[PDB]
Every structure is written in structure tokens, then in C-alpha cells.
Write a protein that binds this DNA or RNA. Sequence first.
DNA 1: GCACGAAGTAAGCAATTCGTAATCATGGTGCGC
DNA 2: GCGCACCATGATTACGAATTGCTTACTTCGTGC
DNA 3: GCCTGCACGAAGTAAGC
DNA 4: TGCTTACTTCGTGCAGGCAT
DNA 5: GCCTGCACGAAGTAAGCA
DNA 6: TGCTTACTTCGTGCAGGCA
Lengths: 845, 781
Amino acid sequence: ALVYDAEFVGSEREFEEERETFLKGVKAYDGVLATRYLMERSSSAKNDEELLELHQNFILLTGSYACSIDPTEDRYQNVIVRGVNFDERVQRLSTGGSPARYAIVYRRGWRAIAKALDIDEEDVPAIEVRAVKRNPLQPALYRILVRYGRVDLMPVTVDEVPPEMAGEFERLIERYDVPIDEKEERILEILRENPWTPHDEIARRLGLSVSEVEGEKDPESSGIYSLWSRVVVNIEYDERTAKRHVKRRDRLLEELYEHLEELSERYLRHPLTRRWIVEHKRDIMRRYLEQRIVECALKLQDRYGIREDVALCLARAFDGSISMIATTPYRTLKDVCPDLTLEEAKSVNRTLATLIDEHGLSPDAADELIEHFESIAGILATDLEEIERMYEEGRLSEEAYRAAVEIQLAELTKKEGVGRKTAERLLRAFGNPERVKQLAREFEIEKLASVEGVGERVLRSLVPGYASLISIRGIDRERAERLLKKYGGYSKVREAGVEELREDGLTDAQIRELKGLKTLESIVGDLEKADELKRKYGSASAVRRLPVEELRELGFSDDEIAEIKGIPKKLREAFDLETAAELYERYGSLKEIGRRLSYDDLLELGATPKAAAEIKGPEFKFLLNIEGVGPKLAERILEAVDYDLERLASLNPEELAEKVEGLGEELAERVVYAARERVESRRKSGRQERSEEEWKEWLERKVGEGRARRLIEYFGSAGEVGKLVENAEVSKLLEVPGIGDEAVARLVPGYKTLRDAGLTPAEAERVLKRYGSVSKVQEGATPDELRELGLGDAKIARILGLRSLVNARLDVDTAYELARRYGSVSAAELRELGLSDRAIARIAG
Amino acid sequence: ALVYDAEFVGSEREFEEERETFLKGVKAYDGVLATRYLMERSSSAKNDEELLELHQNFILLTGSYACSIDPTEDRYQNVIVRGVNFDERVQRLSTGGSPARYAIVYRRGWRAIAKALDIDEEDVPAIEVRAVKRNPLQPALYRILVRYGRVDLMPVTVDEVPPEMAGEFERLIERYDVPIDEKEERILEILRENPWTPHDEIARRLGLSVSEVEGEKDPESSGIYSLWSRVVVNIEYDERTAKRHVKRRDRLLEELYEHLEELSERYLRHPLTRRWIVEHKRDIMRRYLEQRIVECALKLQDRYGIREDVALCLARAFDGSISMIATTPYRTLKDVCPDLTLEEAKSVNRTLATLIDEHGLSPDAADELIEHFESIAGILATDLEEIERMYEEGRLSEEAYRAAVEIQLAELTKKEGVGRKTAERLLRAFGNPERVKQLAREFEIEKLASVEGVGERVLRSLVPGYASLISIRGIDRERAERLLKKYGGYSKVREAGVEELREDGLTDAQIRELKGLKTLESIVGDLEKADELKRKYGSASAVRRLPVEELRELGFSDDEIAEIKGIPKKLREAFDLETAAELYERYGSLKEIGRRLSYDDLLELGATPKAAAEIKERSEEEWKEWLERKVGEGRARRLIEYFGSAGEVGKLVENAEVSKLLEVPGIGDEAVARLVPGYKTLRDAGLTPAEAERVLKRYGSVSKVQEGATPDELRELGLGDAKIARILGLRSLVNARLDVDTAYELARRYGSVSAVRAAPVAELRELGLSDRAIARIAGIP
DNA sequence: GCACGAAGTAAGCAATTCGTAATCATGGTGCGC
DNA sequence: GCGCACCATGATTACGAATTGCTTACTTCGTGC
DNA sequence: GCCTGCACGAAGTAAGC
DNA sequence: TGCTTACTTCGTGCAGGCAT
DNA sequence: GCCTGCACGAAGTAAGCA
DNA sequence: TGCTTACTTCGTGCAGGCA
Ligand SMILES: [K+]
Ligand SMILES: [K+]
Ligand SMILES: [Mg+2]
Ligand SMILES: [Mg+2]
Ligand SMILES: [Mg+2]
Ligand SMILES: [Mg+2]
Ligand SMILES: [Mg+2]
Ligand SMILES: [Mg+2]
Ligand SMILES: [Mg+2]
Ligand SMILES: [Mg+2]
Ligand SMILES: [Mg+2]
Ligand SMILES: [Mg+2]
Ligand SMILES: [Mg+2]
Ligand SMILES: [Mg+2]
């Protein structure tokens, strides 16, 4: 059977204190139950706001009384809930705390504290603090307040409840600047819609387990429990408010019972007196317990696919708390329900499934881990030296210890550049991987770099936004850490003002590179106005697209407006700003302007005949320069060859006068002779190569004078260096001492992207020779083609953007086939193609 | 092997009509299912009032379409639900009606109508009208509207739903003056707390079965179904409103579906389009059906003690309707669940338990009765000649027919003075015992007295309050019936005004006896002011207790105030009204005044020294005068001439010689009771004059009998347990299926008979009581 | 416009560590003296 | 028949690539005459 | 079980033997 | 001139309904 | 973790001076 | 013929959302 028990190890005075506290808590929870009973019995009372306020007041007082249990945090020992010893686990948490209060936040956890206090004064001495729907506080924060015994924070009347502890719970979290991870961010996004969303609903909607959403009740974990724990431990203990609450709550409780007796007369023949409620405790609870059991067995049968018989048995066994079931060891589940399948238990208890179907553990080994650490997130929240201590003392088996260690390491070895040694040293230095990730988000860059082996790659992989800041020239480690701590992240540092960034010791070039305002500061003289434009509009391209009038409004010059939109000199001098800007934004290029508009249209728009001819293509200028073929006739001449000088010298002059309306036949041969006269000069200048000195100039531009002359002295001349660059001879370029990847990537475009994908310089060289540019690799290359070049499937998945489809234990070829048929990677219909939707549904994101 | 089937016997045009109506109902119920799906899936949607309004609108439209099924009430025949032919039963109801609509109010009853109409346009063409929790109407009234096909009454919009059909359902019942019996009165008491209380919850709280709470869907039965049927049939059919609803509902349904598609975007990635809902009907229903099955199997395991396997099998077989399980014959339960015990089936199906453990029926005979009449209340709702016709046609076996007959008669033979012959004649004259009791409640005294054998005792036992009115001198049968029909009951006749009672032809002495205002009319000159005081305060003793100032206000005289409180002449002349009245109400008697007060205190209160000190066998003619006073001169001289003298008559009276007093010709019970005090009460308890004589000799007064005598003591005197329960004031505790010994043990353990009704339910189960009797006495919870 | 820094980054280099392909462990399955 | 040959899958080896630090050797920026 | 409604003996006050 | 029938005024109480 | 939208310099082709 | 601004179209990579 299930074991609920605990023993009292305090003094007799403390014994009387704890008994009085627990009995007042039972009185308060009786009130909770009686108010819900009245709500269920009368349809009029179900709508009464007074009765709901009374119900929430009872919840508040129950929480206050619960917080005062085990104040010295030592009056109880060997607290057992459903057969799990909480004493050992609470000690291993970073914040420690009382095992009594830690137990009472579980379903029917009061049964241990009740036995420890030899309580028999009531029928069911129940105390519960898991209220959700009608709770006047945010439920998780309520439970965490009880776990940490905060009587100062537990309000004793509904009016005293602050909005930052209820619907505006987000305000209280932001007040204390607590590091929040991605999972907690998605959970908060759900909770902002409805703070009273039940936790299993968040788990279902986010595709996590209940254990993943809640987390460990300690600031060093991940989940809503861990998040509130982080927030609460940073709240200083307000002793005066605690004493005031203790003074008020007893007299308040008697007032609530009298208010209920007064209110029950409005709806019943027999008023709900305290005597009546004590003499009917089983009548009140029975309905609520029955609906609990029904909903629990339904969730087990529906969402977890457990047989109706087994699901109903388990709902009966654990008072219908699916949170407690999914954290119960397999042996105990089989003890209370012998027909349970191991597969069903692995279905409901996802920690057991992870320990078996990934770490190949025995059911008993996984039971060890579940009894000691409850969940995987509980293992991650436990210090590594604590696990080694448990293993040395013989309290943990070898298989369980090895599995827990590999679980701890895997949380960090997944990071790029961190292996077993660096993860080992990080865990030694900071205890558990959750704390490591916490220090990473808090931007403790120097604190992390002090560990042996934490270099540039590890910092770029761990500290968010460190890679973006440290890559900027002039910004060193200390400046990056200072900025990230001052503003709160790379995104917040990028949004900072120019003046305050100058105050931090940033050059105008550094700020210009950070914000990307070089193009904007090429127009406006200063950086402040460019940054303000980036604030208002958000993108320089949007500022370019802005109409001429709105650009003139709050603008500086019309020549500046023409420089912004890239208006040609001919187009800006031939027309006004409005018409020229409209033409440029409608056609794009001056050649398209000359092609799709007629000469008469250009004249009507107010262009000089010579200027209107210059707006037209240079073919027009050549035609009129040779023998004045005419502004009216040169257009019809260019209308046949589609504005192409090559097709003009091809066909016979007889075929030329055929298409054009009117053409002199003697002139028809003088224009073909002039067309052939220029295709000999277009070809003479088209096939041209630059000089050796010009290659030297480009090399000095790209890699500086020193490395350029080193390359020139190594090979023949700068012409040979350019020949090797155009052929993508990365291997030969790297042979030169003093030439590395930061020079080759600056010489050969696209080498940096290929090296970032994990490609050997020889592999990047082969790829660049095969496809010629990374853009053509990403769109054109196929996985089999890349395997012909000798690339591993990991590099192929990296370079083709198919990392999502491979992360679900799937191959790269069939992954590319989906990106081939449909447009994107994101695109029931899969059963038509014959796919197992299991992984697609499993990985949500 | 459950049989859900029905055959169509209308025309092809009518066939298309019925098919179109059924398909529109399926559309509406799909809307219901989809709104429920959204509500169960999201906790935020569970609180969305807009989604609830949409859901209730869908429910309303489903009900409206359901009412229009089988309007000619002849388009279907051989309607089979779970293997029961409803055609035969609906015909035997007083109001008849459509077997199609009668079937559709059952769980998965649409499966018979769906087969009758060859419906295949949807995956599960389900139409259900049993909604309870979220139903915008009172659920039982909703179902009774559908069963009677009242399309005029089914609202089509939540805003058009009248309060008299929802939270104020009591108004609609009172509007039509429908006779309500005690079981229906307790059911109404529960429903006033929560009109949407599910019927099995009412069954638990009242300690009844579900069939007892529901009753037959017909005005001549007992239960909430029967009550609403009584109320609905008295509502005239508003044809124009029905046509208006038929006009509106199609476009309203299309607007509801558009509103659902718009609202579903707030909660889902794929909006709930009609196409999506039709192409996913099994996914939507899958969750809801499983929750129904779980609740049903759980209730079967806990409240009925059925094995988990068998309970889950029964819940799955009948789609989780415990009302349907308790009305299913044993053969069907064993067919769908072969491991079911006969004892488990008798636990869940209380009609089967009654037919076996009381009428010694075979399981097959009880199954016969359950197939034909569903429940005991269904047997009581069927005419007796209908049952005899069924027996003559061979449709009912010998054992089943005899059991049904004994059940019908027992409903009337239990009344005092009604035996087998009189019950037989009453059933012949009015068809079924429910109709007999109904006419009794309707105060149809002349209609009942027309039956051969219906005399004074039978009328006093049947017509409520007839015994109280007819006992008043001068009030005959016709006047009693007139008053009971004019005011609505003996209590209402007592509350009537004096002027309107005088207009009916009542003497002032008759009204004074009825209202009990003789003491009040001895103070006030007229009857109207005494009646107004009885209205204001309710009791003459309450008027006596009134303070001196409130009695003086709107009062007449101070001497009258002193006469009311019974103030002695010495106490009223020695002090004023205030102090004397306070002393009299604090001490009671002048002797206590003189004992507990000092002479100096009396002087200080303003009393004269002399007054304060004072405050501090017969002959033959003499006995003959008393005899002339008690029984008149004639009977007195008759008694004197029969015996020795008036002294001998007095000697026999003091010894309670009732037997010898009754020997005298011309001397009856009304004379002996006026001579021997307490004889009237003992005769009214059903005691032989010899038995009353023995009791009066043994204890000396009825007051000392009621407090001192024990049931064994009275059984030593030779009294039947019925007479013992009558005479000891335990008639309440015995009428609740308890014996007289345990009734006296309850009056002994707990203080009074009233004090047993406020005891803990745990201590009553400790005494070995069933929740039926516990609910009769106090009531769960 | 160019001297002339003034920090700051690119490159090298040895030792260590990462990390993924190569191989080993292990449990089946099929062709032959 | 009893061994070995060839797979098949997951686990573990193993060795080339990347990383960690530390130290020069140039490289943009950027003032001032 | 409260409530209406006479009964009746007790007892203090007077007329009559 | 002092003891009896006689007769109100209390004070207490049972009986008979009716309602649960 | 993909994806659109920028930033921004690269680069191939010609007029403008030189 | 040759050295610069001048207009065109990419191609290279970083960042910010969103599921
Ligand atoms: K290293
Ligand atoms: K190996
Ligand atoms: Mg403290
Ligand atoms: Mg050891
Ligand atoms: Mg890694
Ligand atoms: Mg630590
Ligand atoms: Mg370091
Ligand atoms: Mg930098
Ligand atoms: Mg090199
Ligand atoms: Mg026959
Ligand atoms: Mg009888
Ligand atoms: Mg009839
Ligand atoms: Mg008669
Ligand atoms: Mg009469």
C-alpha cells in the first residue's frame, strides 16, 4: 500500500505549536471545502460573488496557516509521501528548506504531517494548497510561497492581495531581474493569457511533460516552480508583515465561519454551522473527490492511452493527481495496481521512459533515480558532487549513478565546443548544469572563463549574444560583459542610445558597426539622427522607400533625398524629385526607363531633347551620333531588335527595312556597317584582363599590404594570386606562412560560411570548385551530390538548412525530399506520402 | 446484440420531410458537440461566456428540430430502443403521442429513427436532447417539450428563453394549478436549490431510484417527468409561434455555424469549419463518450457496488446512461454483459428488485414487465383494463399479470377503509391508481363518491383535508367540495377572509370553529378584527405575549389587555398595567409573586398595605345536573333509568365503564366520549371500545398513555401494532418503512419524534437504516 | 591630405580537447566438410 | 551438425580537426600640422 | 409538538340556618 | 351570636386538532 | 532552430575625364 | 589607352521573430 508517514523530532512546546498550526489549517481548509460544497449545491450561490470571495479568503488563510508549519525547518524528519523520502532530496537542493512544507504542497501530502502530529480531532484532517481555478493568487506562486514558508507574503484577506501576485504576476517577476530560459518564456507566454491555466494543460499545449513545465521547487532548475523559486528567494523577509498576518488570521478565520453561516441561511434550510461542517466532512468532499477521480482517469485513458481498468485504478490510488502519478516509481505503481503494463507506466511517467528507452536502465535502476530525484529536471537540479557522494555512500547503484552522470553531462556536451572534460570541470566549478546555464544567461563571462578550458568557442556557445558582441572590432571580453550586464542582452545593447554607448567607451565606428548605420551616417552628418531614424522607421530600406514629401518633411535637402533613393544624375537633372522618384521606383534602372518609355513621353515630362536622349539607352545616342537616324525613327529601330546592338549587325539590311515602317535602303546598310563597326570595338574591350599592379592593389585592399606582399613573394606575382583566388585554391593559399582563414575568407567570398558549417578547408575548396558560390550550393546541391564530394551527413544537414528534419533520428535524403516537394521545411496529408507523423508531432519547437 | 431499429410507414413526401428535419437536427447537435469539444479542450474556453451562449443556442436549435420529428404522430412504427418496443407503451399512455419523439429522449434513441430514415449522410448521425448542466432550459421541461413535440415552446435563441422555463421554473408550474403529490413536492424542493441538478443526484438525495424521480412521461404518473407532462398538456398550442420558429431556425443555425467558425480561431490553428466537424465527428465525440462511460462505471462501482469489470462493461454497453441501465430487462443486461450477477442487476435495476424480492417473480417474468412498462411507475401509469386486454391477447404471462394487478391494487388498498373491492371499482371507474390519487388531490369528492362503495371513510382517506372540513358541524359534502375547490385546500380555506366565507353561506359559528377565533371573539366584538389579528400574529397566545404598549397601540381598552394576559383582580388593581403584567409574565401566579417578593417591595411598587399583605361525593340530583350538562336531559334520564341513579352513572364514568355505558339503547360514542374524557382520541386511533376501556383503566388518561406507555406494554393489553403507532404518536416514523419497536427506540434514544429528524446520518446507518428511510426522516446531505 | 601612433586583431605554435567516422561488441542467420 | 562468414544495430574506440592560451607581427582607425 | 378551549378543584367571601 | 350551603375568581390541566 | 529583411561590400559594364 | 566615379545586380552573413 501507499506509505504516508512522518515523525516529529522537536520539543514539546514546538509539538503544541505545530499541532495548533495544523488544526487551524484544517479549520481553514474545511472552510474551503464547505464553500465549494455550497457552490455545488445551489445554482444561485454558484453566481454569488460574495461566496466566491469567501472561498478565496478561506484559500488565503489555509495558505497562511500552511506557511507557518515547521518554521525552524527542523521539527520534522523522515517525511514520506506515497513511499518517497523527501528529507534526503530537500537537503540536496540549493536552497534546502523544510521537508514538511515541501511535502504539504503534494496531493494528500498532509497525511504525513498529520501522522507526525498524532492528529485525530477531525474526520479527515486534510490541508491542501494546490488550488488553481478559484485561487486568488497565481497558483504556482501560491505553492512556492507555501514551500518557502513565507507568511509575510501570503495575504490574509482578498483585498490585501496585490495585483502583482494575481493577474499582473508578470510585474513581480520583472521587478527582480531573474534569468529566464526559453522553456520558461513559452510557459510565461501561455500564463499571460490566463494565469490560472492548469499545469498539465500547459504541458499538453507545449508538448512537454508535467515535470518539464513545473520543474524543481528551487531557483536552480527550469520551470514555473523553479522560476517562482528564483523570484521568491530574492524577496527580503518582511518580519513586520509576517507578525501582522499572524495577528490577523485567527480572528479573520472566525469571521469567515460566521460569514458563511450567515450566508448559508440565504440558500439552505440548515445553515452551514461549523458543527454541521465537521459532522459532514465526508459528504462535502465526496463529490469533489469523485469528479477529480473521473477527470484523472480520463486523462490517463485519453492522453496517455492506459486501459480503462488500470487508469481508473490509478486515479483511485493517488486521489486523482496525474502530477503525482507521473513522478511515482514503477514498483509502487505496480504495488497499487498490479495489472499495469511497463509500457503504460513508461507512457504516463515520462522520466521512466527516458531512463529506459534512452539510458537502457533496469526498471529498478530507474526506480532508484525516481525515488531519489523524482524527475529528470530533479536530477539536473542536483549537484554533481552530491550524486558522487550518494554513490560513494552506497545509497545509489552503479547503473543509476552512471546514468545520472551522463544525464548531467549531456545537458552541456550538446553545446558546440564543449566535451566531457570541459563539462566535467564546469559541473565541478558550479555544481549542476542548470546553474551553469543560469550563469550563462546572467552574462557572467569572466566567472565562466576562469574555469580551465573555457575559451572563445565555449563562451560563444554558452553566453547568449557573446558571439555577436565579441566579433565586433575593438570590443574585448570585459567590454562585452559590461555591456551585456548593463543593458541585459545583445538585443538591448543594440537598441541603446548613441550617447550612452559613447559614455561606456565605444568609438563611433564601433557603434556604427553594432547598429549598422554606416549607410545612414553617409547621408546624415551625425549618428544621433541616423539612430533616431532607425528608431522611428526601423530599417534604412523603409527610409529609402519613404515618399518624397515625407522625406522632405523633417528632412534636410532635396539632393539628400535624391542620394537616398539612388536617383541617377541624368534622371535627377532632367526632372523634378516627384516624377523622377516615381519613375525610378516604378522601373528600377535608367535602362528600363529608356526602354519602356517613349522619347515623346520623355519630352512631355519636361526633358531637354539632349537630356531625354541621354535618359534613353546609349544605343539611341550612338544611332543619332552616327548619321542622325532621327529621334522618331531610332526608337522604331530599337523596337525590332529589342534594344540589342548585337542583333543589329546580324540580318541583312533588306530584312531591316522590313520590320521598320520607313527606312532608307542606303541608310539601312550604313547602320549595319556601323553596327558591325562597334561589335568589333565592344569585343575588343569586352575580353580584357587587368594588370599585375592592379591585382597588387586589390590584394593590398583585401588582406593589407604585408600579407599581400607575402603572397606575391610566395607565388609568381599578383596575377598568379588572382588566378588561384578565382580558381578557389584555398589549400595553396594557406601554405603561405602568415596566411590564415581570416585572410582566405576575405579573399574567397563564401569561405567563412563553409568553415562555420564544419567543413575542412579542403572540403570547402572542393565545394567552391564544384558549385562556385554558397548560394548556389544551398539551392542546387543535393545530399547525394555532397556525399560524392566526401562530406559527412552532419555537414550536409548543416549546409542545406535541413537540421530540423534530421534532429528527429531521420536521414538527410528523405528530409531533402520534403523540402523538394513543398516550399518550406515546415510544409494528416503525410499519410498520403506514407510517413510516420510520430517525430513531426513529437518535436514541437 | 442491442437492437436499435424503427420502420417508416409514411409517404415519400413525408419521408423526405422527416429526413430533412433529422439532418437539420444532426447539424445542430454537431454544433453542440463541437462547442463542448472546445470547452473541454481549453480551460480558457471553459470560462468563455460567448462560447457558452453559442453552445446553449446550439442546444436550443437541436431541441427545436427534434420537436418537429413525427408531427402527424403516425409516420413511424415498431420503434425499438435497446430491444424495447416503444409503440406498445406510448399507446397505453393517457396522452399517447409520437413513439419517435418518445424514443428520441432516450440515450442513443436517435439510432432507431436514424435507421427508419436510412440516414447515411454523416458518420454518426446523432441527435441527443438530454443535456443537463449547460442546458439553457430546465432539463426535464426541455425533454418533456421534445416528447410532446411542442415546437411553439422550444425557444430558438438564448435571449428569447423565458425565465419561467429556466431558473424561475416554479412560476410556470404554479401558473396552471397542477396537482402535485408528496414525492414530486420533495423533488421540487431539491430542484429549487438547483434547477439543473441531475436526476440521479436527486435520486441519491431523496433515497429513491432514478425511475421514481423521473416517473412516466405522462400526466398520470408520479415524478418530475409526470409533473412537467401535467403542466405542458394544459398549455394551448400556439401555431403562429411554431411557424415563426420554423421560419427562423434554419438561418439562425447557419449564423451559429458562422459564429463558431469565427470563434474557433481564438482557440485552434484549424478553425472549426462545418467540413472539419463532419470529417472529424469520431474525434470530437471520442473524449466526451469516454468521460460519460467513466462517470457511469464509477457510479456503478461506488453507489451500486458492482464489480469494476462488470460495471465498466455495462457503462460501455449503454453509452453511460445509468437511467437506461436501471430500466433494462435482466436478459438484455446478461446479453451485453454475461458476467453480471443477478444480485448486481437487482442492485442497479430497482424495478427488478421490487418485482423479485417482493412479488416473488421469475427473472423472465420481471423482464416481461420491464419490457412492457419499463418501471413500477410505468405500471401504475397504465390503465388496469389495458393490462387485462394485454393479458387476454396473450401478450402478458400469468405471473406477470397477477403481479401487475397486485401492484395496481396495493396503491389503493393501503388507504384506510379501501380494500380489494373498492380499489377494483375505483380502477374500473378511473383507469389507473395515479388518476385516482389525482382526482383525490383535485378534490373531486362527488366524482369519487359516485363509485359504488366510496363512503365517508374512503373520502376521508383519499381527499386531502376532507376529514378536517367535513368534521365541522353544518358543513356537508357539497359545501366541503365547494370550499376545497374555491380556495385550494383546507389550509387555504382556513386563511380565507371572513367576508368571503360568509358569502359562501357559512354561519359565524362555523367560521369561528374553523379559524378557532372563539377566544379572540370573546375579546374583540366582531370576527373581522380577530381574523386580522390571526393574520398579523398567527396565534392567540402570541397576541397574549405581546407587550403592554403594542397591545395598547391599535388596541381598545386597558381592561381588555388585563383580561387577555389573565391578570388577577388584586394584581390589576394594586399596580398599573406595565408592572403587573411584567410581574405576572415573570412569575406566572400570584402565589409566586407573594413568595418570591417581599412586603417592602410590594409597598415600594405602590400597593396598599392591606392589599400588599394579601398579595404576599354528591347526591343523585347533583350528579344528574352534570349528566344533563354533558349529554343533554334526554340521554341523562335514559342513563338514570337504565342503571340505579345518577350516582351509579357517575361511578361508572369515573371508572371508565364504556362497555356498560354503551349497552343503553340511545347512547353512542359521541355521548360516551363527552362523558369519559379521552375516549374520542382512543376511538380515533382505531381502538375497540373494550380496548379503549382497558387502556383508560390501565393508565387513567390518554396524556399519561402517550408519554409513559411502551409498545410492549400496549401489546400486553392486546393492541395491534398499527393502533400502537397511532396512539404513541409514531405514525411519522412507521410510514417510512420502519417497524413500531425501532420507532419507539428512536423516540427513546433521541428525545422527541421531531428530534429524530435532526440526527446525524452516520448514527442512522449505525442503527442499520437505508438511505431511503434516512432521506424520509432527515435527508442527504 | 598623410605622418605616427594606439590599441587591437590575425597568425603561429605546442599541448589539450573535441567529435565524428571507423571499428568493436553482440545477437542472428545462412552456406558447407 | 557445429563453425564460420556476412549483416544489423548500438556502443565504443580512435585519430584528425578544433580549441585553449600565450606571443609576436602587422592593421585598421584617427587624431593633428 | 404548539394551540385553542372548556373542566374542575381550590379558596377566599358572603347569605342562611 | 357563631357554623353551613352557596357562589365567583383563580390556577392548573387534560383533551382534541393539526401539522410534520 | 528556419526565414524574411536588411547591411554592405563585391563586381561586371560603361560614361566622364584625364 | 588608361584611371575614376557611376549605375546594376548579386552574394555574403548577421539579426530578430516565431512556433
Ligand atoms: K583545449
Ligand atoms: K571501437
Ligand atoms: Mg526566518
Ligand atoms: Mg563502495
Ligand atoms: Mg558538443
Ligand atoms: Mg551551488
Ligand atoms: Mg580560462
Ligand atoms: Mg572584437
Ligand atoms: Mg598559413
Ligand atoms: Mg388465452
Ligand atoms: Mg387498508
Ligand atoms: Mg383514462
Ligand atoms: Mg357512494
Ligand atoms: Mg359536516
